[PDB]
């Protein structure tokens, strides 16, 4: 092997992505980019992903399992607050047992 | 401050962004994504940049600073070998002092 050995820290991570976040399979975000959590009137880490978002696409419902077993989707999420629609993928983290969901506005 | 704790590992880093590379200040290419690697005609790693990718936007040289400077700009690469463009960011991580190009055609 010459595995991959880099990545991006956490702060560059929500500097590159001000509009991910990532959440654990009792379905609680644990993380969010620097401009989602600063728009949201309620602070976002702690509460679960479906007081806060819908999924549009794929038509699923917003479950742990059922995601990270469509690591190709695009998915596509609304932000209840705003109605603001983000697009990206949702990437499962196994080591740490949460999902990334790495999205930005789509225009 | 509350500041973010969590990041994807290299691995998944390679899955998630299969076109990205990332390279060091001596501007030889440090690693890869998967499809990156499968595409190019001679591996890639341990290569200098400019011996296989052009940059059309910004014009710029291909220097680490230069595009250390240009945080916010959008870089479209022309892979020289195949004239394949990726568009993407370029993004400067202190600690391992190496730039991340996280593009896609």
């Given at each position: 092997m010459a595995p991959p050995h880099l990545?991006?820290?956490p702060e560059l991570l929500a500097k590159a992505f001000p509009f991910h976040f990532a959440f654990s399979?009792?379905?609680?975000?644990?993380?969010t980019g620097e401009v989602l959590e600063r728009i949201s009137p309620e602070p976002l880490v702690g509460?679960?992903?479906e007081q806060h978002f819908q999924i549009?696409?794929?038509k699923i419902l917003i479950?742990?399992?059922a995601?990270?077993?469509q690591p190709r989707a695009l998915?596509?999420?609304e932000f209840l607050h705003n109605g603001m629609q983000l697009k990206g993928?949702?990437?499962?983290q196994p080591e740490e047992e949460v999902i990334f969901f790495l999205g930005s506005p789509w225009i």
């Open positions: 990545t991006l820290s399979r009792n379905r609680e975000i644990v993380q509460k679960l992903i549009n696409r794929p479950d742990f399992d995601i990270s077993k998915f596509i999420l993928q949702m990437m499962y």
